[PDB]
Amino acid sequence: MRILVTNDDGIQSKGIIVLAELLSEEHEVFVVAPDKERSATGHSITIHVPLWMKKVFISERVVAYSTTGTPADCVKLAYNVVMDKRVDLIVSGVNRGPNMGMDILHSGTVSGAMEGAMMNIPSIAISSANYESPDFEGAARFLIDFLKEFDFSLLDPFTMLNINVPAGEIKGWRFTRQSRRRWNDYFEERVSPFGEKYYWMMGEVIEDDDRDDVDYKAVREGYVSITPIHPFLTNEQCLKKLREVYD
Amino acid sequence: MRILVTNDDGIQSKGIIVLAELLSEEHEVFVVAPDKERSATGHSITIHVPLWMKKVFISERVVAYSTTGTPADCVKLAYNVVMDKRVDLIVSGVNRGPNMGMDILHSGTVSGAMEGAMMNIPSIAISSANYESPDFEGAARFLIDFLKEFDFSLLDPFTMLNINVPAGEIKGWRFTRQSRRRWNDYFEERVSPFGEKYYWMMGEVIEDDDRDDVDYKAVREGYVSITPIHPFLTNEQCLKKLREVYD
Ligand code: VO4
Ligand code: VO4
Ligand SMILES: [Ca+2]
Numbered sequence: 001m002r003i004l005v006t007n008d009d010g011i012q013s014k015g016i017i018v019l020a021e022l023l024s025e026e027h028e029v030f031v032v033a034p035d036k037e038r039s040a041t042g043h044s045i046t047i048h049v050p051l052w053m054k055k056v057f058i059s060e061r062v063v064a065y066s067t068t069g070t071p072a073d074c075v076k077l078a079y080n081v082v083m084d085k086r087v088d089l090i091v092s093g094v095n096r097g098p099n100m101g102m103d104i105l106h107s108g109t110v111s112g113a114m115e116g117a118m119m120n121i122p123s124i125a126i127s128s129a130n131y132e133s134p135d136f137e138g139a140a141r142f143l144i145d146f147l148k149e150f151d152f153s154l155l156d157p158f159t160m161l162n163i164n165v166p167a168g169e170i171k172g173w174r175f176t177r178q179s180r181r182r183w184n185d186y187f188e189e190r191v192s193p194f195g196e197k198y199y200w201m202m203g204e205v206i207e208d209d210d211r212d213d214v215d216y217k218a219v220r221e222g223y224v225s226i227t228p229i230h231p232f233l234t235n236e237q238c239l240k241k242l243r244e245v246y247d
Numbered sequence: 248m249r250i251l252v253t254n255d256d257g258i259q260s261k262g263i264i265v266l267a268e269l270l271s272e273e274h275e276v277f278v279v280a281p282d283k284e285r286s287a288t289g290h291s292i293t294i295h296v297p298l299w300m301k302k303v304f305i306s307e308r309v310v311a312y313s314t315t316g317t318p319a320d321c322v323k324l325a326y327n328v329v330m331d332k333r334v335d336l337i338v339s340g341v342n343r344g345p346n347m348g349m350d351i352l353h354s355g356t357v358s359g360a361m362e363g364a365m366m367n368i369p370s371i372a373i374s375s376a377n378y379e380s381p382d383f384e385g386a387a388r389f390l391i392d393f394l395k396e397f398d399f400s401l402l403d404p405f406t407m408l409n410i411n412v413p414a415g416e417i418k419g420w421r422f423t424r425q426s427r428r429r430w431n432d433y434f435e436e437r438v439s440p441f442g443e444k445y446y447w448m449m450g451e452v453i454e455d456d457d458r459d460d461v462d463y464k465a466v467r468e469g470y471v472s473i474t475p476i477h478p479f480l481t482n483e484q485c486l487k488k489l490r491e492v493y494d
């Protein structure tokens with residue numbers, strides 16, 4: 001397969017390097033990633049200014065470039081100016097840290113894969129669920145094994161797989177639904193040298209999902225969480241009720 | 248919905264034309280069919296040489312392409328190259344003549360639909376059960392109506408519907424099982440101008456199925472035969488016996 005590999009931690013992250021190398025053992029791998037820290041950038045794109053690319057070195061057989069854009073920008077550039085519009089699979093990661101629940105909306109890792117979904121290209125976002133002690137090779141190894149056991153015809157149009165791999169011992173994997181895991185954010189106030197106050201964003205996690213098949217619960221149990229997600233945010237149930245009340 | 252229409256007689260067949268046109272009245276239809284005769288081609292596919300496609304005209308409303316491949320090749324090409332992996336339904340037909348019993352293994356019509364089933368795409372193989380005097384419109388009209396009343400969520404994984412429509416009167420439809428209808432075939436031997444003998448395959452049909460709910464019996468009684476089939480040939484009964492006998 002012609003695979004495009006990107007991430008949000010920069011082309012110099014161990015997470016993307018390990019992943020790119022392993023996939024190159026049996027696939028035509030191309031790497032187009034950000035040249036800096038792009039975490040928490042969500043699905044932002046660059047349209048007001050020019051985008052720049054730089055050919056870098058990852059390992060022979062692997063064509064790589066760094067860009068001044070976001071993960072989503074990287075996928076757009078890779079598709080049109082690097083891969084001749086021929087991409088069989090996109091893998092964004094391996095991210096250092098989990099991307100579950102509502103946090104996926106501000107996730108740069110997920111955004112890369114989601115841009116692929118928007119372009120209707122099979123895409124996967126993969127994250128190592130332990131920021132403090134990530135396991136990049138383990139997550140990449142899981143992906144290799146997963147590909148040999150996953151039927152992409154079952155991945156609907158415009159859909160991607162958001163994968164979270166537990167750092168410890170993998171007991172297995174489960175197809176999950178996105179949880180409503182979110183945060184009760186708050187700010188710590190401080191004062192600058194020039195007397196102006198500033199704020200640091202902090203927060204306490206909220207894990208109150210009642211369903212057992214949600215992402216974080218599987219990861220918590222030592223299972224890889226695999227959620228099929230797509231760029232369609234319509235709340236169907238709400239729309240149906242709204243249409244019943246308003247004619 | 249996005250429907251892929253194909254067949255095994257050729258993109259210039261009256262059976263596929265009538266079907267595409269009628270379906271294009273309410274759906275976005277794409278036609279990808281063989282550029283020549285493909286009856287009796289079974290589930291063959293092209294892997295040793297390249298495949299080619301040609302844009303052709305069928306109706307100012309349908310996107311059509313002929314290919315140098317088999318019916319199964321047509322579906323693969325349609326799904327991966329023409330329809331951008333966006334196929335809601337696959338309809339192979341309307342074939343001139345029945346496709347029942349063991350003949351479905353040699354059927355190019357069934358093969359196209361089976362390729363769809365293998366990708367878990369709702370698929371239908373449809374034939375007008377009368378080679379001599381077929382009724383393409385009647386079969387097509389039946390399908391249109393069938394699509395408005397059948398719930399495809401009832402189709403198990405990897406399962407397609409093999410449909411045979413009576414050429415005369417359609418008293419109604421009934422779910423059937425594949426029969427063991429086959430042929431007492433032999434060869435008509437002849438001699439060429441250069442003294443070498445050649446063989447013409449010939450045969451008389453065999454209808455000796457005792458079961459009452461088989462395909463040809465339904466068609467014979469004026470009912471549309473609808474058989475749910477899948478790509479699994481294991482003889483469970485026999486497997487059970489051989490197991491309890493040896494090991
Ligand atoms: O670092 V993420 O933006 O992909 O959590
Ligand atoms: O022409 V068939 O191969 O589908 O009887
Ligand atoms: Ca990150």
Ligand SMILES: [Ca+2]
Nearest residue numbers: 255256286342
């Ligand atoms: Ca035919």
Ligand SMILES: [Ca+2]
Nearest residue numbers: 429430431432
């Ligand atoms: Ca025979």
